[PDB]
Write a protein that binds this ligand. Structure first.
Ligand code: NAG
Lengths: 49, 49
C-alpha cells in the first residue's frame, strides 16, 4: 500500500470511470422505464371489447 | 480532495491495521550439524564432490 501510494492518480481515474459507468446504468433504466410520471392503476372492470 | 459533494462514494480500504504477530514453526530441538560440514577433518576432491 505504501508503494502504491504514488499511483493514486491512476486509481482515482479508474474509480471515476467505474463510478461513471455505474451512474450511467441507473440513468439508462430511468430513461427506458420512468418516462411516465404517474402510476396509473388498471381498472377493476376488464371490459376491453 | 478536501471537499466532497453530495452523493455516495465507494471507499478504498484504509481503516484496518494489524497490531499483533503470530509465529508458528515446527518444534525441533537438535542443533543443526554445523561442525560436521564446516569443522570436518577432510573435505572431498572437487571432481568427487
Ligand atoms: C569448530 O572447531 C573449532 C576449533 O577448531 C571450535 O572452537 C568450534 O567450536 C567448532 N565449531 C562448531 C560449530 O562445531
Amino acid at each position: 500500500s505504501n508503494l502504491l501510494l504514488q499511483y493514486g492518480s491512476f486509481c482515482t481515474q479508474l474509480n471515476r470511470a467505474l463510478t461513471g459507468i455505474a451512474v450511467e446504468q441507473d440513468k439508462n433504466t430511468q430513461e427506458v422505464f420512468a418516462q411516465v410520471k404517474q402510476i396509473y392503476k388498471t381498472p377493476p372492470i376488464k371490459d376491453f371489447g | 480532495s478536501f471537499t466532497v459533494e453530495k452523493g455516495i462514494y465507494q471507499t478504498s480500504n484504509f481503516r484496518v491495521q494489524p497490531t499483533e504477530s503470530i509465529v508458528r514453526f515446527p518444534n525441533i530441538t537438535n542443533l543443526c550439524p554445523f561442525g560436521e560440514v564446516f569443522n570436518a577433518t577432510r573435505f572431498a576432491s572437487v571432481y568427487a564432490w
